[PDB]
Amino acid sequence: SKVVYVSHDGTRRELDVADGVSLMQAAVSNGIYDIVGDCGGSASCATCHVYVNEAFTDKVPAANEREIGMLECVTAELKPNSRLCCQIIMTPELDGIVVDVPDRQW
Ligand code: FES
């Protein structure tokens, strides 16, 4: 799947994430996950605070109730379609997904 990561400084990094892989898995491989995953990707923290283009949020597997509670624990401003990276599974059909990462993810 074509995955685009929009950093805070504006630098964009695009990777290929295979089916069943989490945007978090491909990030650690392209040097993008340097967000110090607290739960280590076990979906138990809010360090993976990112913004998924509202166009893939209602398409990729609806975030689980564990993310909603961790989403209220983020350090930056939440968005109506705000999402995390360790609870989303990429797929070829959803290729073109745009992920927006802020300057405050803690
Ligand atoms: S990396 Fe910990 S909740 Fe996503």
Curated annotation (Swiss-Prot):
Cofactor: [2Fe-2S] cluster
Entries under InterPro entries matching the protein: 2Fe-2S_ferredoxin-like_sf (IPR036010), 2Fe-2S_ferredoxin-type (IPR001041), Adrenodoxin-like (IPR001055), Adrenodoxin_Fe-S_BS (IPR018298), Beta-grasp_dom_sf (IPR012675)
CDD domains reported for this sequence: fer2
Ligand binding ([2Fe-2S] cluster): C39, C45, C48, C86
Signal peptide as annotated in the record: none
One GO molecular-function entry: electron transfer activity
Gene Ontology biological process terms in this record: P450-containing electron transport chain
Cellular component terms (Gene Ontology): cytosol
Cofactor stoichiometry and binding remark: Binds 1 [2Fe-2S] cluster.
Segments forming domain 2Fe-2S ferredoxin-type: 1-105
Keyword Electron transport: yes
Task of the protein: The oxidation of camphor by cytochrome P450-CAM requires the participation of a flavoprotein, putidaredoxin reductase, and an iron-sulfur protein, putidaredoxin, to mediate the transfer of electrons from NADH to P450 for oxygen activation.
Self-association state and partner proteins as the record states: Monomer.
Family: Belongs to the adrenodoxin/putidaredoxin family.
The protein's name in its UniProt record: Putidaredoxin
Phylogenetic lineage: Bacteria, Pseudomonadati, Pseudomonadota, Gammaproteobacteria, Pseudomonadales
